Design a protein around this ligand. Structure first.
Ligand SMILES: Clc1ccc(C(c2ccc(Cl)cc2)C(Cl)(Cl)Cl)cc1
Ligand SMILES: ClC(Cl)=C(c1ccc(Cl)cc1)c1ccc(Cl)cc1
Lengths: 226, 10, 240, 9
């Protein structure tokens, strides 16, 4: 496994270079709103799958293990990405550069919307760095479905933990500040997990409503949680 | 047989 | 606040002292059990544990400093998580089994699609056993769940201080965890790794809680398994 | 508010 032989700086560089692009929206009622967000989610999903392959250690797993991990964490990964690029837009969610949205604007959603805003506010309060974000995102990918299958994944997770500490040490944080910040970051994943589950349940009702056009891929990823 | 399988292999 | 003035060792002793008791079930190995009667035992057991949990929360350093409203919010959010991690903990030395009560030790075969959750609970217990989780580490994690699960859903300059107060207590618990691992002879690298491993498990605990909450709603609508007024009250708080 | 009742008794 090449992933464990990588240094900390090389781990960061690998993750940064693997970053998926920022997509645009196809440019508001409740039918058009959902249609746009799901359309965007389906296209981002395709990029996520290609991003997952470039995550150090993910290629070393069997195809079936990769499928399990992605099925378990895809909505979390979408959400933490949405939260990340919404950091510099307080009170707003940047789904796309041409789609910066209000909490004013179709529910289901307001609960999840405010939670996403709250996460974005927490990141901003912590001054979350890009190098720290890509580590958290990869952690979600490997951790979220690891308890539903082991040694390989846990060792890669340990590697990312070392990488996170490496970043904090480089930033000039003290020994106490390092494990405190490490704690603050990983505790946020618990909330992101919560948001995903709430978002998944809402997605099930959208399917049962049979109004919003959902792609077969987005439907298959939705079936995995049912 | 799923779409996720195909995208992961390409 | 005295929570910010407690040493690591003093923090541990405070948590160990506040530990709720292990309750017994009214399960009877002679009497037969329908899937609803068995479920009734567990929900009844969960109800009695909740009362002990609430009085346990009061003794958690930093919790009583919060407003009454904030205490209700945190408990309404993390009550099933705290139950599950407690269940998982006392099931560590019973591989492939869940010790709901000293007289109620079940495996996955003993029912109704709750089985997925049952397996995740086993896998969590297996994870703790593999990691050789210590009681001092357990009580820290449990207190973390209480303060962290609902902190991201609480507007004013005054409320701001309450959330900041919560995170400050969380840091002290983090410090306490690190102090424990350091005393255990672990290197700095090993301390940070184990800390990460423990906190990542809380993500899985959140997952099981969300799943369990979904079933509890379905049981209410099914109206077969008895549920206490408090349990229904905690349940509706999540379904909102 | 049963929880609120138990939180102050
Ligand atoms: Cl497999 C399973 C069994 C019981 C639970 C709960 C549970 C957890 C801990 C305790 Cl002590 C009692 C009941 C419910 Cl019944 Cl409240 Cl949903 C969750 C999952
Ligand atoms: Cl359901 C879904 Cl796919 C959501 C989603 C859509 C697009 C992206 Cl990039 C990320 C997430 C979603 C978005 C907002 C809210 Cl408040 C709830 C859900």
């Amino acid at each position: 496994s090449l992933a464990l032989s990588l240094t900390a700086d090389q781990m960061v560089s690998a993750l940064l270079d693997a970053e998926p692009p920022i997509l645009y929206s196809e440019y508001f009622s409740e039918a058009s709103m959902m249609g746009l967000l799901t359309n965007l989610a389906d296209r981002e999903l395709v990029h996520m799958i290609n991003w997952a392959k470039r995550v150090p250690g993910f290629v070393d797993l069997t195809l079936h293990d990769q499928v399990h991990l992605l099925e378990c964490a895809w909505l979390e990964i979408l959400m933490i990405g949405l939260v990340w690029r919404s950091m510099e837009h307080p009170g707003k969610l940047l789904f796309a550069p041409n789609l910066l949205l209000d909490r004013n604007q179709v529910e289901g959603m307001v609960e999840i919307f405010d939670m996403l805003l709250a996460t974005s506010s927490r990141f901003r309060m912590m001054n979350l760095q890009g190098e720290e974000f890509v580590c958290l995102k990869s952690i979600i990918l490997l951790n979220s479905g690891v308890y539903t299958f082991k040694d390989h994944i846990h060792r890669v997770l340990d590697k990312i933990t070392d990488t996170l500490i490496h970043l904090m040490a480089k930033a000039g944080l003290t020994l106490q500040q390092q494990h405190q910040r490490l704690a603050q970051l990983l505790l946020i994943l618990s909330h992101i997990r919560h948001m995903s589950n709430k978002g998944m349940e809402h997605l099930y009702s959208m399917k049962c409503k049979n109004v919003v056009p959902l792609s077969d891929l987005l439907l298959e990823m939705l079936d995995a949680h049912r | 047989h799923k779409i996720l399988h195909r995208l992961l292999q390409d």
